[PDB]
Amino acid sequence: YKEEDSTVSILPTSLPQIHRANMLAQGSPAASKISPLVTTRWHFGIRSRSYPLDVMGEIYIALKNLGAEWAKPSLWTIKLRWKDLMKMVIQLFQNNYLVDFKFDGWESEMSTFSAYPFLHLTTKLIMELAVNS
C-alpha cells in the first residue's frame, strides 16, 4: 500500500468478506444461505485413436450428406468444395492420428473475410461426425 495526498480509495464496506460479514450480523434469514460465486485447452484439428480407414470413411460419409463434394483421388487427403463454392482441404496425420481442416478459397486477404463461414461449415461437419459415432 502506497499513496500520498491522494484521496482515491477502495470503499472498505464493499470488499466481499466485510459486506458478507455485515449482512450476517444483520441477521437476514436468506443471508445465511447465500454463498460467494466461483469460476481452454486448444488442440490442433481432431484426434482419434482408431483405424485411419474408419476415420477417413466417416469423414466422407458425413460430408456427402452435408452437401459437400470432393475430387477424384489416387491417399489421406480430401480436396473438397462446399457451398459461391468454398474450398477446403482435409489431411490425416499419424497408433494415434490427427485430422487437419484447412480453408482454401472460393469459387463459383480473402481468407480473413472468410473466417466465420469456414468455421461454421467445419462446425456442422464435426457435429455430423459426432452423431454418426
Binding site: 470413411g57 489431411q91 468455421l119
Partner: protein
Amino acid sequence: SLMVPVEIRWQQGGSKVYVTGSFTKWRKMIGLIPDSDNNGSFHVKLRLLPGTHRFRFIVDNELRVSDFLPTATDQMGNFVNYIEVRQTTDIPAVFTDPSVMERYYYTLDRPPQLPPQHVVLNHLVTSSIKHNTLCVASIVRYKQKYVTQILYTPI
C-alpha cells in the same frame, strides 16, 4: 545458431539512441549507429531469433516509439514497436466396402507423419466439447497482425 539478420532504424531526432525490447528482456540497451549518409537517422544490425519481437527506443534518455514503424500494444497496454522475423459424390470404396478394406490390411501388414507444426496457420483449432455447446477457432491474419477467431456454437 540460425538467427536471421534484422536492421532496426530511428529517424526522428537525437544524438544518443538505444534499443530495448523482448530480445533483451527489456533490461539492457543496444546502441544505434548514425547513418553515414542521412543525418537525423540511426540504425543497427542485429541477428534476432525467428518470431515476433517487441521493442522501443531510448532517445537521449527519453523513452520513445518510432512513428514510421509497426506499432502494437502489449497484453497490459504498453505501446511499442515490433517486427516479425521469418525463415464427385462417390466415397471411394476403400473407405466403405469391407472387401476392399481387408485387401488393404493384406498389402499393409505385408498416413504421413504429422509435421512438427504465427505465420504457418489458417487451419482448425478445436477443444473438448464442454457443454451442449462446441468451441471452434481459426487463426487469421489482419494486415500485419493476427487474430484468433473463436466461434462458439450450440451442438
